[PDB]
């Protein structure tokens, strides 16, 4: 019985099927005042709400999907036809995300990826037919960042004008990420101040919107 475990146990009973804002409570109360967990919690959420509400997004990736708390938080907003893929390495994470996506109802429009981030990139285009990302998530280990942000500039994923929304730019941090992407030609940076999920401590979204 792992903490991942309860985290579903608590949706699969407190949380009604097939509402998506529904879930994302349940796993915000668990973990607000039982178990901590990394999701981007309910703060920085409403921020990539914001977002991804602004820029709406065709094709969608996110890095890191551990429990699917970003990925329903994410995909609950997508224009009817849109796709959001997301890499998850570990496979107890990566088969949780997808019963957490089934009770939500938005099994249809997130795809799983089962692998290393560095591995399925370079496979992105063709196994899963992509041209060009519209927005990618960054959430997945903090020293993933920016290989993983040449990674997706190498393999041309990356179109002008792509959104990258980057987790915990403050805490733990992803220093050598925001000092590339900050100092950077390529890309134009806002920072949105907010709070470390489930904490009174200072965290925050980095936006850096690519520009070829
Ligand atoms: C911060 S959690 C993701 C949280 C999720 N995005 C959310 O906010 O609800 C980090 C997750 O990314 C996964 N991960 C770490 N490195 C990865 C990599 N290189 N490729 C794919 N997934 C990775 C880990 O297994 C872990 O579950
Ligand atoms: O422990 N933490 O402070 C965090 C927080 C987070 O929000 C994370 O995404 C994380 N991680 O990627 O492993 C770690
Ligand atoms: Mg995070």
Not at 56 to 70: F, K, M
Not at 140 to 169: F, I, M, Q, S
Not at 182 to 190: A, M, Q, V
Not at 198 to 209: H, N
């Amino acid at each position: 019985d792992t903490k991942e475990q309860r985290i579903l146990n608590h949706v699969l009973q407190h949380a009604e099927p097939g509402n998506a804002q529904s879930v994302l409570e349940a796993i915000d109360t668990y973990c607000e005042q039982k178990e901590w967990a990394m999701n981007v919690g309910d703060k920085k959420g409403k921020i990539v709400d914001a977002v991804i509400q602004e820029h709406q997004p065709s094709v969608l990736l996110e890095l890191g999907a551990y429990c699917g708390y970003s990925a329903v938080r994410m995909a609950r907003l997508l224009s009817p036809g849109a796709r959001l893929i997301t890499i998850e390495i570990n496979p107890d994470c990566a088969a949780i995300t997808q019963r957490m996506v089934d009770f939500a109802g938005v099994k249809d429009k997130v795809t799983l990826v089962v692998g290393a981030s560095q591995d399925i990139i370079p496979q992105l285009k063709k196994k899963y037919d992509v041209d060009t990302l519209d927005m990618v998530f960054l959430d997945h280990w903090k020293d993933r960042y920016l290989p993983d942000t040449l990674l997706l500039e190498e393999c041309g994923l990356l179109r002008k004008g792509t959104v990258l929304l980057a987790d915990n730019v403050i805490c733990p941090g992803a220093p050598d990420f925001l000092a590339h992407v900050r100092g950077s030609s390529c890309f134009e940076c806002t920072h949105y101040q907010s709070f470390l999920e489930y904490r009174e401590v200072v965290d925050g979204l980095e936006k850096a919107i690519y520009k070829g």
